[model samples]
Target: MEDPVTGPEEVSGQEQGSLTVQCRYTSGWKDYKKYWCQGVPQRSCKTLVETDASEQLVKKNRVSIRDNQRDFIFTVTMEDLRMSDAGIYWCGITKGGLDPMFKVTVNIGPVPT
Candidate 1:
């Protein structure tokens, strides 16, 4: 049975995105700790969600980091897509507002067919 368009067809696998957060948070009294958030930068990167000198981390059960490499790799999967996740994910040492964050805007373009 074939119905052509809008019929039951084989679905293909697609890629969402991959991002890295690395920064030299040289604003506050810290030397190494570079906190950052990567999301829609133009919209909300300036939001200093938290401000604590020693509190230089925004980790959850899903977030991971390593000081040896001085870098952060965020694995953004399709299942991780949510409306609440539509903001700038910053990663940088705590300063006044926020340091330079690696911003990534999702749903900004069409899927390449």
Candidate 2:
């Protein structure tokens, strides 16, 4: 049986700093395209990064994603975060479409010193 997908669920990072989160999935889906998206609703979310199956570690600017198929997990990082970056996000797995969503709440800063 396939294991349920999991992630940090909630993440907090300071403004102007950075944070990374892991999105883990079953081994069978290793070839799937992983993505980090922004918005409260998964479907409406704009894809920030195509997190996996890419030749480069950073598919998007400021947002980066790495896939570790051997480790069965993919990671996404946001750098130089801003106050406008605070919002609901999701770790998306592309099978046929966005079926299930691994939600994440990205909280931006207590203001960096």
Candidate 3:
């Protein structure tokens, strides 16, 4: 059986640029709240952006998240990337039982001249 949720293990972007991470989940979770968080530990991770159980996109500062129920996928975008933005992040989904999670490593590099 496929995992409940899955995403890229790592993603990279240049400073001042942007990166998008796509998280795919199995069916039956379309109405759940999806979120993007940053931290090493899942429980203590700080939420950067989240969806409201709808397809409407949510943005906070330089981070944004959108849930596409039709595709069973949600995406998180980080804009105006900076070196400090490189870290461990997680794509999460809130559910009745244990929430599903996918870890992502973000890498930021110097911008080309």
Candidate 4:
């Protein structure tokens, strides 16, 4: 553990990773008002823990918003999870024709063996 893959730790306790672009569809594919994705399996992306009437009685954070105005933060946790929780996760919005207002992609590391 002496030699690390990256380098020495930093003063900022923040995590390190990246967010990819994700695009998914809910039940209302035909009547899909807008492309608003969320809680995709990724890093540092805390899957919408909870949501209330704040956003139409929604869950998690926001579909068209991010932390610190960064196009990321849609993180999800791993370990001690269930397989039934496996699914494509994303956070985006519909702008107009064939274009989502907010689009973000996230990824997760492989589970332990």
C-alpha lDDT of residue 50 in model 1? 33
Per-model C-alpha lDDT, please? 0.34, 0.79, 0.92, 0.28
lDDT by residue for model 3 (1-113), tens = 37888999999999999999999998888889999989966787898988999999999999999899998999999999999999999989987766889999999999777
Better of 2 and 4 by lDDT: 2
RMSD of each: 14.8, 2.1, 1.3, 14.0
Model 1 C-alpha lDDT per residue in residues 1-113, reported as the tens digit of each score: 12111111111222343223333232323443443344453435453233233334434433444332332222222232334444434444433564344343433222477
Give per-residue CA lDDT, model 4, range 1-113, as digits (tens). 21101111111111232222222323223232322233433332343432220222232332232111122122222223334333444343232444332323333443445
lDDT per residue as tens, model 2, 8-96: 86998888899999988888778777888899556888989885464357658889888888887888999998888888888877767
Candidate 2 overall lDDT versus native: 0.79
As for model 2, its CA RMSD to the true structure in angstroms is 2.1
Runs of candidate 3 exceeding 4 Å displacement: none
TM-score of every candidate relative to the true structure = 0.32, 0.87, 0.94, 0.25
Number of colliding residue pairs in each model: 15, 0, 0, 14
Off by over 4 Å in 1: 1-30, 38-58, 69-83, 95-98, 106-113
Preferred candidate (lDDT higher): 1 or 3: 3
Could you tell me which 10 consecutive residues in candidate 2 have the lowest summed lDDT?
51-60
Candidate 2 contains a number of clashing pairs equal to: 0
Q: Which candidate leads the pack in TM-score?
A: 3
